[PDB]
Design an enzyme around this catalytic site. Structure first.
Site, PDB file in Angstrom:
ATOM      1  N   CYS A 235       5.065  -0.117  56.648  1.00 30.28           N
ATOM      2  CA  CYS A 235       5.335   0.304  58.257  1.00 30.28           C
ATOM      3  C   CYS A 235       5.785   1.848  58.282  1.00 30.28           C
ATOM      4  O   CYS A 235       4.982   2.421  59.585  1.00 30.28           O
ATOM      5  CB  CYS A 235       6.940  -0.179  58.307  1.00 30.28           C
ATOM      6  SG  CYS A 235       6.969  -1.887  57.918  1.00 30.28           S
TER       7      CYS A 235
ATOM      8  N   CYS B  93      10.772  -0.478  55.786  1.00 27.71           N
ATOM      9  CA  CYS B  93       9.498  -1.008  54.966  1.00 27.71           C
ATOM     10  C   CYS B  93       8.539  -0.042  54.826  1.00 27.71           C
ATOM     11  O   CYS B  93       8.207   0.769  55.631  1.00 27.71           O
ATOM     12  CB  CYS B  93       9.391  -2.411  55.757  1.00 27.71           C
ATOM     13  SG  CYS B  93       9.085  -2.212  57.479  1.00 27.71           S
TER      14      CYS B  93
END
Length: 107
Positions: A33, A30
């Site tokens: 992230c 992600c």
């Protein structure tokens, strides 16, 4: 300083301590992230010697988010003594994280 830690390793440093701690949950699959990399590395040095800082990978450690009430998302948890008091879900800027910890973790 902050680093990538493991479920069996972080507790021996954080949970065994009385200092305020910051966790950041993330995974490399992600965008926001993995983009927290330079975010955690700034703020980790703003709090040094009086605050503990670690990031926890939810692909390598799937039980660590689950036991703190998380799935697999960009979320950070601020606590003390190995026991939760407050969490921050969703991505936030290093500037916002410092401006928050300035009272929360530094007292």
């Amino acid at each position: 300083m902050a680093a990538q830690i493991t479920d069996a390793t972080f507790e021996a440093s954080v949970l065994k301590s009385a200092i305020p701690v910051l966790i950041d949950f993330w995974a490399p699959w992600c965008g926001p992230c993995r983009a927290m990399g330079p975010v955690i590395d700034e703020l980790a040095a703003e709090y040094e010697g009086k605050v503990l800082i670690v990031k926890m990978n939810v692909d390598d450690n799937p039980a660590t988010p689950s036991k703190y009430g998380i799935r697999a998302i960009p979320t950070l948890i601020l606590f003390k003594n190995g026991e939760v008091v407050e969490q921050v879900t969703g991505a936030v800027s290093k500037s916002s994280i410092k401006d928050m910890i300035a009272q929360k973790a530094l007292g």
